[PDB]
A paper describes a structure:
The mature VSG proteins are attached to the cell surface by a GPI-anchor, and consist of two main regions: (1) a large, N-terminal domain (NTD) of roughly 300–400 amino acids that is most distal to the membrane and (2) a smaller, membrane-proximal C-terminal domain (CTD) spanning 80–120 amino acids beneath the NTD that harbors the GPI-anchor. These large subdomains are elongated folds centered on a three-helix bundle scaffold.
[name] and VSG615 are related to VSG3 (the topologically-similar class of monomer/trimers with O-linked glycan PTMs), denoted as class B or N4 in the literature. Both reveal a fold similar to VSG3 as well as the presence of O-linked glycans on the top surface of the protein–one observed on [name] and two on VSG615. In addition, alignments of the VSG11WT-Iodine crystal form with the VSG11WT-Oil form show that the second helix of the three-helix bundle displays a significant conformational change in the region near the middle of the bundle, the helix becoming disordered and forming a random coil in one monomer while keeping helical structure in the other.
Author numbering:
A (entry chain A), B (entry chain A), C (entry chain A): 24 to 389
């Protein structure tokens, strides 16, 4: 008969999912953001430019103000319209002569007399072109496109766990278990050797695996605990949908008190830990202790949840069980984010190198 | 006594191995293949070369055909024999004047008058040398040598699972369990507190852990299932070797219906999940539920497989249990492939950068 | 009642921790050490330098000996004191004329007449500055600072497992279980539904989960084994602290015979495998099979260890359970080491590229 602790294995696997939800899943990768360095190189290039070049960025009446493109259109016989936004950004602080002199000092160009500035300028223009080619590389934008957001990933995880964008509070306000489709009795709600459950997410699966009910507190209702049953008071033969208080008495078996470092490997391990616990039969697969007939919560029956989507003849969880597919999508997105973070560290180092060289007066003359 | 579901833990661990076999393990890493970019840079270098240089690649009678190295030997006083294959490859389409002009346009060199082409040529020759130095780096060939193939990895995984290069079909055609050495009774086949099993791979270990037999369908034979026993009909006291139909009734408990993304971490976790389930005793270690004496399939004995290779005094699975060592070899190969993929993305980005610069007419003049 | 094999799940999880200790955890990452290449580039730069430059590194009396900085101070009107150590290192072998000629040959500079050496020198000085900028990048020292040592990581792991810098020998010499605080009886030592254990590390937790004692050899004392109980002889109602012989009879259930490749993912998986096995109650969480009251080792009570630090209302193991926090610290340090190894492969490849170019006579003239 099913008794105390018989579902500890399954509880652990499902809580490894639950604990990811809320805002607890964290992208601690940070990001290689090299825009600061690129902007500095472009500003250094403008600072070293011939004064008639910086003069193109000035208003013809107030030389301290930026050129307006209606008042002074960019000549059609140039490619200046393709490059103006970045040029004007680099020029804007330099329109102030005192700021231009301050930047000349910041970039180690203020000791240069005209012919020596001309020489350095050639090297700076070359380094600047190389910086743009490295940082504007379509592959850089490719990696940047594969960068995910903690908010987006957290939303998808809460969809897998709760079918909501956010984790329900401790009263489960706004949440209805089994999407309002619970009926009849525990075995109808949780499934059997022939029928699937009414669960659509990981939380409600955990509830079927771990909740006690009115009839099994002395025996099977202790399957996920030690000494004392959860005490849900669930009476599904009379009132099929458990209340929020009931759900929380099961969720509190899981660690909602810490954080998890999001990595594809971590998600993969957690999904496999559930997926291979599914006991594949002819018509359903069962998660949880099962002895006979159905997941009715009786000690001679089962404390479990059943799925028709995978059996001993078909189906993989990450494709065919919706909540698990949703979580596998997070693993996929994380793998791409991880590859992008690695790739983007290269232009970051390269831009730092170029800025070091561009600020080295001896190299520029060389 | 051993009964329904008592081996779910062990089944899950072993199915995490089985599911890797067949063609289901996938190298989704793809590869940084930068040959296209290197070839383009070399062709651009040849396109910009002085016409007497491209003329070295022509047949002396038909200037549209490539030079034959018997007819017109490469002068011994040059190093041209060290470089000819790559040069001739770059020159071949350019021997056609219309194609040479088309390539001049493709690479943004067709607007250049002779003295301006000479200037650009100097920069192109420098960028081309840098491209070769980055992409021919012995460390690039080092990483390329550490690139593995999905086919090779899949073969090794099937060796660990089945002792075959490929996964047996659903009738297990061509396969003999226990390599033909099964004899006597279940406990001789599967092992005991004193003797190791006759299994040599992961499939036949799973069979010992999970198969029902003629004597235990009502009790221990349900150790890996829910309601209904596998129904192998195995009668090892009479006919020791199980048939292919019998083997499949156990393999279908595992997910052979999806795919797994090959990573060293994923293999490592799956091996550890088996290895630390081995219950280490004085003379053998046991995988599966064991109560007394041996792995005979009796509910008072064990549903299990035994190994002499590791005990409470010696042995690590990834070195001393052959099937597990074979799988650990895949983890090792995957770790190197992963490091190589990371390293090779650097020359890929660098070559894209160089091609961007080489096609920028303003940079070339700079 | 708790009987044979009921704690195999928990044993496996805890042995996945124990097996990391000793010297068995291995940083097989190796390291990108590019100092050899940087030193060679700096020596090549000095080899190609004008002879009056190399003469600055000579003693004024014995031209074969290095300049002494008291005898011949570095002029205050230069920045030579900022660069001398690396310059003198590059110059030292070259003070010997025969060695200078040998290095000229090694670096492919010995065929160069004076005007051709002048041309090559310009390129070498430029490549050398680029090498320093790439390898002296503050981000390189940042990554190098995030490089961990196998010795440091191994020490922290032994602290989590044993509260010692090193793994106790097979007699547990120098080690006292429960830090000398064991008293009264097994349930006082190991904890209950209301009180935490006296364990302070992972080894002593494993002992509470897996040791037999004088009263349970026929039943609960077989929870972590197959046929034969560990045979500790522990009599905690009389002598509370187990002896070293007793401890070893439990540790030998774990794999202390192999090695583990240190990775953050591997540590993360092993911690989660323990943490989510903790059965969270109102006042304690329990690791191990528990039926009633306490972890007394009785078959009707529990074979387990209890923690007050996490419950169904608070606490995450990697922050609030000291031994687990200590191991989580290793995961954190490993993640940074892994990111640093990846980042540092970039300057390594770049320096190899530069050395290839600097040794290419045709490129230098270009
Ligand atoms: C770092 O800082 C440097 C400055 O130090 C900055 O350099 C500037 O780069 C831009 C972009 O490369 C240069 O833009 C060119 O500007 C010339 C000059 O235009 C003025 O003068 C002409 C002649 O008197 C006037 O006609 C014109 O109205 C302007 O007043 C333009 O002539 C260039 O346009 C031609 O080339 C483009 C390609 O680059 C074509 O797209 C365009 O259609 C033009 O081509 C036509 O003329 C060609 C003649 O040879 C002909 O071959 C074509 O077929 C076609 O008919 C171009 O816009 C600008 O001069 C640079 N500034 C200086 C002072 O040198 C860098 O941009 C900066 N780096 C970064 C990364 O920001
Ligand atoms: C990008 O595109 C460029 C072209 O724009 C291309 O450049 C070519 O590079 C190759 C390889 O560096 C150059 O090859 C050299 O060719 C000369 C010329 O040979 C002809 O003319 C001589 C003189 O009349 C004849 O004797 C000869 O038979 C040929 O007709 C050779 O002289 C060079 O060989 C010497 O140097 C080699 C080292 O590079 C030695 O290995 C070789 O033994 C030779 O050395 C001898 O002479 C030296 C004299 O100084 C002496 O010092 C040595 O001790 C020894 O006695 C060499 O083969 C070729 O000229 C370039 N082409 C042009 C038009 O400039 C790039 O290769 C391409 N980039 C890439 C990456 O593909
Ligand atoms: C690869 O190999 C090359 C050699 O091939 C090597 O190059 C050497 O680099 C160093 C560092 O850049 C150069 O150091 C400079 O040396 C000059 C020369 O000093 C002598 O001669 C002067 C004049 O007769 C004497 O006064 C002096 O006592 C020495 O005898 C110094 O003048 C330089 O110092 C000035 O510039 C520094 C900035 O680099 C300032 O920090 C310093 O205060 C000095 O500035 C003063 O003078 C300036 C005059 O223009 C003025 O503008 C300032 O405001 C200030 O008043 C400097 O120390 C050395 O010359 C190079 N060697 C050669 C032969 O060219 C590379 O270092 C090597 N690469 C690597 C990576 O190792
Ligand atoms: C589960 O199985 C038991 C035993 O057959 C049965 O009594 C229950 O009614 C069923 O739900
Ligand atoms: C396994 O153990 C049981 C109980 O001792 C025994 O009856 C069987 O014969 C043996 O194979
Ligand atoms: C553990 O629980 C059993 C059953 O109530 C009790 O008999 C023991 O004394 C206790 O330690």
């Amino acid at each position: 008969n099913i008794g105390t602790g018989d579902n500890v294995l399954h509880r652990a696997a499902l809580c490894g999912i639950i604990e990811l939800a809320g805002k607890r899943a964290k992208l601690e990768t940070a990001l290689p953001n090299f825009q600061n360095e690129l902007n500095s190189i472009l500003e250094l290039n403008m600072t070293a430019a011939e004064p008639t070049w910086l003069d193109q960025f000035r208003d013809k009446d107030d030389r301290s103000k930026p050129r307006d493109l209606t008042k002074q259109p960019l000549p059609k016989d140039t490619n200046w319209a393709d490059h103006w936004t970045a040029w004007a950004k680099a020029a804007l602080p330099l329109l102030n002569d005192e700021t231009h002199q301050a930047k000349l000092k910041e970039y180690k160009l203020a000791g240069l007399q005209p012919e020596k500035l001309e020489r350095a300028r050639n090297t700076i223009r070359r380094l600047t072109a190389e910086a743009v080619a490295k940082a504007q590389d379509p592959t850089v934008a490719e990696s940047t496109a594969d960068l995910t957001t903690e908010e987006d990933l957290q939303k998808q995880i809460n969809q897998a766990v709760y079918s909501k964008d956010t984790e329900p509070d401790d009263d489960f306000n706004g949440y209805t278990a089994f999407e309002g489709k619970a009926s009849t009795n525990r075995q109808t709600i949780c499934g059997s050797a022939v029928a699937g459950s009414k669960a659509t997410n990981a939380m409600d699966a955990l509830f079927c695996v771990c909740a006690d009910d009115r009839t099994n507190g002395a025996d099977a209702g202790k399957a996920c605990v030690a000494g004392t049953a959860p005490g849900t008071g669930w009476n599904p033969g009379v009132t099929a949908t458990p209340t929020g208080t009931m759900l929380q008495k099961v969720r509190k078996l899981c660690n909602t008190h810490g954080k998890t470092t999001l990595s594809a490997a971590a998600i993969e391990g957690r999904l496999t830990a559930v997926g291979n616990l599914l006991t594949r039969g002819s018509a359903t697969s069962i998660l949880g202790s099962f002895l006979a007939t159905d997941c009715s919560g009786d000690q001679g029956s089962g404390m479990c949840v059943a799925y028709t989507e995978v059996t001993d003849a078909k189906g993989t969880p990450t494709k065919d069980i919706p909540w698990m597919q949703k979580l596998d999508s997070v693993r996929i997105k994380l793998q791409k984010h991880e590859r992008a973070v690695e790739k983007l560290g290269k232009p970051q180092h390269d831009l730092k190198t170029i800025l070091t060289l561009a600020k080295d007066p001896a190299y520029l003359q060389l």
